[PDB]
Design a protein around this ligand. Structure first.
Ligand SMILES: Nc1ncnc2c1ncn2[C@@H]1O[C@H](COP(=O)(O)OP(=O)(O)OP(=O)(O)O)[C@@H](O)[C@H]1O
Ligand SMILES: Nc1ncnc2c1ncn2[C@@H]1O[C@H](COP(=O)(O)OP(=O)(O)OP(=O)(O)O)[C@@H](O)[C@H]1O
Lengths: 237, 377, 73, 248, 370, 70, 239
């Protein structure tokens, strides 16, 4: 750092962009979210990390529905994620409105990235988004190509990932994922694998309240709020 | 009052006891010979002359004395530029004096070996590797460097956040150096007399030159005048002269020759530019806050001695430590044992460390470590 | 720069500086003896050492230019 | 440190620039008001009196804002002129839209929202003016109000803002009687409080400005007492002190 | 009138402290030793027994040693004692540390145990585990595998009695206690001051278990800022020597450091790091329960009326420090003596709190605003 | 306007030991050097007649051994 | 990095200026809320009567719409602005959609207004953490809270302002399914929780109740006293 971090406008003598890197750091404050993409479908798992018994579990939204075929998991600032999540929800519906078809997971990730990129364009909606967003979004959906999982980052950079981890314990989760992931993994096998990795990397015991799971598969729709099966899958493992 | 009287009576009894209690051939023949034996004050010869030698000697603060050789001496044995002992009464060089050892400089040499292996230092493989080829491999196997015709850096500066492990690595090099290690006392170099410390720095290099291949560790370089504001007040003038004397002896007009210098500073920015310039110190090995693999390794090494359940996950504990120096990771391990001692459980459990992780980092006023803000999840 | 510390001071160092000035000023008119001196900072040096002819020669060393750097490497 | 921008928030959640402006009101002429059953009053200290100054302008610290409302200003002189105009504008704008005199609390809330905005927006400094509002509205009857540079407002049976406010508030809290103010008694309380707060000796008529608002025949009749009316009240206070002599 | 017995005990103790040669061998040594003996450094050792000795006059003549008790103790840097005239080494080297270091050692602690302190029980637990517990039961630490924490910092607002915990440690410590202020290293001479820091530590190692208290550490080490004007504090060099002693190569042996600062933020990060201050203790301003114990302890040895309500004073006013409580108790006694009543009424305590708290004015308009 | 010509004049016409003692002259580097000047005056006033001091050249301080902590 | 600038991040990853705004909420008077089967109730503290000052003007609990009421903790003026904007939106939602505002919508609207101030310099993040309690159409009672950070959450029961943490710890033990069993028992739970951090003042409480079928009513001071006495009797019975 050493100065040159005052704005995304300034460039480092090294040529690095500070502030964009600082926003990448904000994701670490987030709870870990693990997504695995398999031929049967894409599985998303998250650590709810409920702060108090009194607070309602539903209000913390770590896994949200962008559309019937697409689901998203967010690690990072809650408010920033909401602006990006709304754009993805409007865009999937607008693509349906203009083209009478379901938007591909990659195209939604690209569309969301376009707003994320405008950290400081200086032309678009002036007085809005003067800083980089601090949220990393995992988009898991089944499109015409097939099940696809895409990771976006605060810098507008997106990639297709067979398995990925975001948030605190992402680094630990990725190392575990490389050992566990294989091309022929079934969605059921992947769902068990994701929670096993989540249990190892979360300090609290993996009780049903602690973990929220989601799965999108070609035959069914979003189906990304397994409810009371959170207890069933955990007990079997 | 009666209890106070008992103590007063006890004191009176002690007073009665004290009052009642009240109611080698070297010291023989040798002393009679020893008292007549004369003294020979030390002095340093500067020159010699033809015919009567008339060697002229500066006593050490007194005067240039034209003293003839003593009758019972060999003229050849007395030499120009040799310390000698001159009797005050006979005003002659009764016996020559061996060269001054200058023990304070000798004391700084480590002599003993600190018992720390490189294995104990953890999470800095790259920093260890950089030190190995400026400290151990060039000295142990100079042939490889010669084959590429590449000289070793011959200088190293270790800088990093406090508690990173810079000194721990240095003691580890001392354990396996196989060459003289000269730890330097920074306060010793500063001295009451003007430039007295600068004289010591010349001696430090002279001692280093006499030994073959040696490493000098200037820990806390900031103490050795590692800045050159050199303002008009010149409060640091005596130290600034000491710093410059180190710089010239280090490099310029024939440098270390066989001396490798290791300098460790918590604040690198304060160091004077001339010292920072390479040649004096070619390598710049900055130690860095350990990454998650390093944080797990430091936890494992520190906790290996402690008795704990075999199922503890250091990876989770290291993850919970976002930016922790090695000393703070050691502080978590010791604190976790202290909580088990408080509850009197001989074998500690994962929970004890988590309480310590909160205590060592979050409980300290880091503020970032303790979260009251919902802001991000 | 000559210290203005009152009473106790590093008087000896100023005396050494004066001795060099004494040899340089109004002495060594013969060019048989010449002195080369170097400093990382010229700012500390007193104006007296340069004087008018005591150390008239100046040899500024510039930081290496791009052409120079390729040759130096 | 955390000063300059009204926008910056100190690590203790404190807006120093707003706090500095609220403290600044102290360097201003004393302004005090008493709710007074069957009336309401505003009293001010006419500072900076000089032989050459004409004082031709009617009033100086007391400005009417409507047929049934008035305010006394203590703060930066220029900011006061800006706020008084806006308060007058809001009063007529409500009358144009609803054809009824603006309820007093609303006029105060509206200026307070404008004052509040200056604190939340980076470019401007927080207003340095604090003012007292006297008026009668059908919804809540005779009322008295205080506004702060922070934009906070309150309704006070009695309060003071300029100069030695704490001394007046302490004197007012003991002397004031709830429901028994009876206008003429309230005027006496003001002259006595003014004598204590002002370092001026004898409280001469020129130094004091008194404005009284009463509802007569269904119409508010805001009046600024003339010097002769002020003089008789001062003589009565002096005579009362003479009666107090020996007994005290 | 039991005071006379107590005064007698003190006088008797002083008398006891006040009351605390060979036929031929000693007389021969007495003859050998000069009436005046000058102590000087040993520079070189020679087998002939004539060893070079450095002196203030710098006469380094080789001088014979004839020490009856032992002459094998000679070492480089030892301060040998020499005859004023002959200059021969008289005998066993003098072994006394520098005078400034001797003043720090404390043998008597005025305060008693942790009983006087009330409501700092969590703070007492930390100091005990770091200081008293390792010495009393060394086995527990070895079994855990933990090495006992050796350094503590007490940081609190003024009057939270951080020093009182230190005085309590002195009352019940096996270890020799060296009490040195952080502001006691102002040596004018260049050098010397960093050397004094080395001297305090060498003495602590010599005395084996030792506890070092450095009250007001802010003066010795703060920020480590650059020379700037060029005055050059040299205090930074002194702090660096302390930093070296605490964890700078070698080891600290068995010496424990307790340090107290009103402000901890100013203190430089390197000094306040694990390895120099493994355990950190915070003294907060007393709350309610802590205040009750302190108010009781201060009023325990004074006449108390039934009318006085200790709870009312504590609950009504919040912000008073533990020291402030003691001042209220002393002031209340004086308030009663004005009315010539030895017994203290509730009214006296109420008047006392007002008088003590007149200099503490805090807050601005932060009332209507929030 | 003639204050110092009068101040010097008082020194010329004085029978006292009017060491005008402008604030900065023989004064050395010091912090709070007001005592050194006054102490000399008391002794001189005692030696002859009460001495008189004129405060001018008030740059006695601002010495090299001077500077507040921050 | 730097604390001063809403948009500069920190090397750790924190917008400190936003966190500094949360401090103003803590310095505000304590306010508590509970979700009841038919009587969502919010409690307020620190009436702090100032002698010659009228207390109609102080309004810590302000209704936004018929089905939704709100209690603010933090700077008073900033709260007045947020309450008014929420009030306008509630009416606008009825004009845009002829259905009453669901409680979640108004909390999302308040969160969005708060986030918009956080996004750019030239604006100060609002220093309030309002608690919004109401019954939505379909008669479901709900309680939500909004942080100054612009985040919003749904809470069965929560506390904000000075000593909020203490009240929450009390609710963690006290709040039970039985406690919300009766309308009076829910009012009692707010009074008991408020009493712990309200000091012994007792009078310094202004609990307000939403019937979820009727309208918000501020409880009469005498009615509040009767509940306080009933709580004291129950405590004596337990002894
Ligand atoms: N990488 C590491 N591996 C093992 N122990 C470590 C490591 N880093 C720090 N420590 C621990 O910290 C201490 C070592 O600190 P060290 O002697 O290196 O000085 P430092 O604090 O880095 O130096 P300075 O004060 O000059 O910054 C020991 O307690 C050691 O066990
Ligand atoms: N009364 C006087 N008669 C004649 N000449 C005078 C008189 N007063 C002043 N002057 C002339 O004016 C000059 C200026 O006087 P002087 O410098 O003492 O003024 P000052 O206002 O005391 O300023 P300063 O304090 O800087 O000395 C005198 O030196 C003298 O030449």
């Amino acid at each position: 750092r050493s100065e040159y971090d005052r704005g995304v406008n300034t460039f480092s003598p090294e040529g690095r962009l500070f502030q964009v890197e600082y926003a990448i750091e904000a994701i670490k404050l987030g709870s870990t979210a693990i997504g695995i993409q398999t031929s049967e479908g894409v599985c998303l798992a998250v650590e709810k990390r409920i702060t108090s018994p009194l607070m309602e579990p539903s209000s913390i939204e770590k896994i949200v529905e962008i559309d019937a075929h697409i689901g998203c998991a967010m690690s990072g600032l809650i408010a920033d994620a909401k602006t990006l999540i709304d754009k993805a929800r409007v865009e999937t519906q607008n693509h349906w409105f203009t083209y009478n078809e379901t938007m591909t997971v990659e195209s939604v990730t690209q569309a969301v990235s376009n707003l994320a990129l405008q950290f400081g364009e200086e032309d678009a909606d002036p007085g809005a988004m003067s800083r980089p967003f601090g949220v990393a979004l995992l988009f898991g959906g089944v499109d015409e190509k097939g099940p696809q999982l895409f990771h976006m980052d605060p810098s507008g950079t997106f990639v297709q990932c067979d398995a990925r981890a975001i948030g605190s314990a992402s680094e630990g989760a990725q190392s575990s994922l490389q050992e566990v992931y294989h091309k022929s993994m079934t969605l059921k096998e992947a769902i068990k694998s994701s929670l096993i990795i989540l249990k190892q990397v979360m300090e609290e015991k993996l009780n049903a309240t602690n973990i929220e799971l989601a799965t999108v598969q070609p035959g069914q729709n979003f189906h990304m709020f397994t409810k009371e099966e959170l207890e069933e899958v955990i007990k079997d493992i | 009052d009666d209890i106070q009287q008992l103590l007063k009576k006890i004191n009176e009894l002690t007073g009665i006891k004290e009052s009642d209690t009240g109611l080698l051939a070297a010291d023989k023949q040798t002393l009679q010979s020893e008292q007549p034996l004369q003294v020979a004050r030390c002095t340093k010869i500067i020159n010699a002359d033809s015919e009567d030698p008339k060697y002229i000697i500066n006593v050490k603060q007194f005067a240039k004395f034209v003293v003839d050789l003593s009758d019972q001496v060999a003229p050849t044995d007395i030499e120009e530029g040799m310390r000698v002992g001159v009797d005050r009464n006979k005003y002659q060089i009764h016996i020559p004096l061996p060269p001054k050892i200058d023990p304070t400089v000798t004391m700084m040499q480590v002599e003993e070996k600190p018992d720390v292996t490189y294995s104990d230092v953890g999470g800095c493989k790259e920093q260890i590797e950089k030190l190995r080829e400026v400290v151990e491999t060039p000295l142990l196997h100079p042939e490889r460097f010669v084959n590429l015709g590449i000289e070793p850096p011959k200088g190293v500066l270790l800088f990093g956040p406090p508690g990173t492990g810079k000194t721990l690595c240095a003691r580890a090099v001392a354990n396996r150096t196989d060459a003289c290690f000269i730890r330097v006392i920074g306060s010793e170099l500063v001295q009451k007399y003007v430039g007295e410390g600068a004289r010591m720095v010349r001696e430090l290099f002279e001692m280093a030159r006499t030994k073959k291949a040696c490493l000098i560790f200037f820990d806390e370089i900031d103490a050795i005048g590692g800045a050159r504001f050199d303002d008009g007040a010149g409060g640091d003038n005596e130290v600034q002269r000491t710093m410059l004397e180190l710089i010239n002896q280090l490099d310029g007009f024939d440098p270390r020759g066989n001396i490798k210098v290791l300098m460790a500073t918590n604040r690198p920015d304060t160091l004077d530019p001339a010292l920072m310039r390479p040649g004096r110190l070619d390598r710049k090995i900055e130690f860095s806050l350990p990454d998650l693999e390093g944080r797990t390794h430091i936890f494992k090494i520190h906790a290996r001695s402690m008795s704990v359940e075999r199922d503890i996950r250091f990876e989770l504990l290291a993850r919970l430590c976002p930016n922790s120096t090695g000393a703070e990771i050691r502080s978590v391990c010791t604190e976790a044992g202290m909580f088990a001692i408080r509850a009197r459980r001989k074998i500690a459990t994962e929970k004890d460390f988590l309480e310590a992780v909160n205590k060592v980092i979050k409980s300290y006023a880091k503020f970032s470590a303790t979260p009251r803000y919902m802001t991000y999840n | 720069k000559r210290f203005d510390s009152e009473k106790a001071g590093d008087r000896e160092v100023q005396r050494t500086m004066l001795e060099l000035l004494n040899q340089l000023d109004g002495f060594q008119p013969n060019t048989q003896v010449k002195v080369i001196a170097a400093t990382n900072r010229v700012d500390i040096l007193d104006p007296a050492l340069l004087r008018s002819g005591r150390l008239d020669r100046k040899i500024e060393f510039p930081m290496p230019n791009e052409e120079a750097r390729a040759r130096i490497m | 440190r955390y000063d300059s921008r009204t926008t910056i928030f100190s690590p203790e959640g404190r807006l120093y620039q707003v706090e500095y402006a609220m403290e600044a009101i102290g360097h201003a002429g004393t302004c005090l008001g008493i709710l007074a059953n069957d009336g309401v009053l505003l009293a001010a200290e006419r500072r900076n009196i000089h032989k050459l100054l004409d004082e031709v302008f009617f009033s100086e610290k007391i400005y009417k804002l409507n047929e049934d409302m008035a305010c006394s200003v203590a703060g930066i002189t220029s900011d006061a002129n800006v706020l008084t105009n806006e308060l007058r504008l809001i009063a007529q704008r409500y009358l144009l839209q609803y054809q009824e005199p603006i309820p007093c609390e609303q006029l105060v809330t509206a200026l307070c929202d404008i004052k509040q905005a200056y604190t939340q927006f980076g470019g401007k400094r927080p207003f340095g003016v604090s003012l007292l509002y006297i008026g009668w509205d059908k919804h809540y009857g005779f009322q008295l109000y205080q506004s702060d540079p922070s934009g906070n407002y309150g309704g006070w049976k009695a309060t003071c803002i300029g100069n030695n406010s704490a001394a007046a508030v302490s004197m007012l809290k003991q002397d004031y009687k709830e429901g028994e103010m009876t206008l003429k008694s309230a005027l006496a309380l003001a002259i006595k409080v003014l004598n204590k707060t002002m370092d001026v000796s004898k409280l001469s008529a020129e130094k004091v400005e008194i404005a009284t608002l009463t509802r007569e025949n269904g119409k508010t009749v805001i009046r600024v007492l003339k010097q002769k009316e002020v003089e008789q009240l001062i003589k009565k206070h002096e005579e009362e002190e003479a009666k107090a002599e020996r007994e005290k | 009138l039991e005071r006379i017995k107590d005064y007698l005990l003190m006088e008797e103790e002083f008398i006891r402290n006040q009351e605390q040669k060979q036929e031929e061998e000693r007389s021969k040594v007495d003859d050998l030793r000069g009436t005046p003996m000058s102590v000087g450094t040993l520079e070189e050792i020679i087998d002939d027994n004539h060893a070079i000795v450095s002196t203030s006059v710098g006469s380094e003549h080789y001088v014979s040693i004839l020490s009856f008790v032992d002459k094998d103790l000679l070492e480089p840097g030892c301060s040998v004692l020499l005859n004023h005239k002959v200059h021969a080494v008289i005998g066993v080297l003098m072994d006394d540390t520098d005078p400034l270091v001797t003043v720090m050692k404390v043998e008597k602690a005025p305060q008693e145990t942790y009983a006087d302190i009330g409501g700092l029980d969590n703070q007492i637990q930390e100091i005990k585990e770091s200081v008293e517990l390792p010495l009393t039961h060394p086995e527990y630490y070895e079994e855990m595998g933990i090495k006992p924490p050796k350094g503590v910092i007490l940081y609190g607002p003024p009057g939270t009695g951080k020093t009182l915990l230190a005085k309590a440690v002195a009352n019940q410590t096996s270890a020799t206690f060296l009490r040195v202020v952080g502001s006691e290293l102002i040596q004018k001479y260049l050098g010397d001051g960093p050397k004094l820091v080395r001297e305090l530590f060498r003495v602590a190692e010599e005395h084996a278990p030792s506890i070092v208290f450095i009250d007001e550490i802010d003066a010795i080490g703060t920020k480590r800022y650059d020379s700037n004007s060029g005055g050059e504090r040299e205090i930074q060099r002194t702090m660096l020597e302390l930093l070296n002693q605490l964890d700078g190569f070698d080891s600290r042996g068995d010496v424990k450091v307790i340090m107290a600062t009103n402000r901890i933020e100013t203190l430089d990060p390197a000094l306040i790091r694990p390895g120099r201050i493994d355990r950190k203790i915070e003294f907060p301003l007393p709350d309610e329960k802590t205040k009750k114990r302190i108010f009781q302890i201060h009023t325990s040895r004074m006449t108390l009326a039934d009318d006085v309500t200790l709870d009312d004073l504590i609950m009504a006013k919040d912000d008073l420090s533990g020291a402030d409580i003691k001042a209220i108790c002393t002031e209340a006694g004086l308030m009663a003596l004005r009315e010539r009543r030895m017994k203290v009424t509730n009214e006296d305590f109420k008047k006392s709190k007002e008088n003590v708290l007149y200099k503490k004015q805090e807050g601005t308009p932060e009332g209507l605003y929030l | 306007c003639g204050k110092t010509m009068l101040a010097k004049a008082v020194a010329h016409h004085t029978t006292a030991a009017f060491i005008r003692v402008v604030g900065s002259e023989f004064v050395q580097k010091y912090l709070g050097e007001g005592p050194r000047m006054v102490r000399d005056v008391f002794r001189l006033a005692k030696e002859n007649a009460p001495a008189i001091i004129f405060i001018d050249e008030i740059d006695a301080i601002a010495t090299k051994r001077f500077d507040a902590q921050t | 990095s730097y604390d001063r600038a809403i948009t500069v991040f920190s090397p750790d990853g924190h917008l400190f200026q936003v966190e500094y705004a949360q401090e103003a909420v803590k310095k505000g008077s304590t306010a508590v809320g509970v979700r009841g089967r038919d009587i969502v109730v919010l409690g307020v503290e620190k009436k702090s009567v100032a002698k010659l000052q009228d207390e109609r003007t102080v309004r810590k609990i302000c209704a936004l719409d018929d089905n939704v009421c709100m209690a603010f903790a933090g700077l008073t003026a900033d709260a007045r602005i947020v309450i008014n904007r929420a009030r306008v939106e509630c009416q606008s939602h009825r004009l845009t959609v002829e259905d009453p505002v669901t409680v979640e919508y108004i909390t999302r609207y308040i969160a969005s207004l708060k986030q918009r101030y956080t996004q750019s310099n030239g604006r100060r993040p609002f220093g309030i953490s309002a608690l919004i309690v109401g019954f939505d159409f379909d008669g479901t009672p709900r309680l939500y809270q909004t942080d100054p950070s612009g985040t919003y959450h749904a809470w069965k029961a929560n506390a904000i302002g000075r000593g909020a943490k203490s009240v929450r710890e009390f609710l963690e033990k006290n709040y039970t399914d039985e406690a919300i069993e009766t309308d009076d028992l829910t009012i009692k739970l707010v009074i008991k929780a408020l009493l712990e951090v309200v000091q012994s003042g007792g009078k310094n409480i202004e609990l307000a109740v939403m019937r979820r079928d009727q309208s918000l009513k501020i409880l009469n001071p005498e009615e509040i006293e009767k509940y306080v006495a009933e709580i004291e009797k129950e405590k004596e019975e337990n002894e």
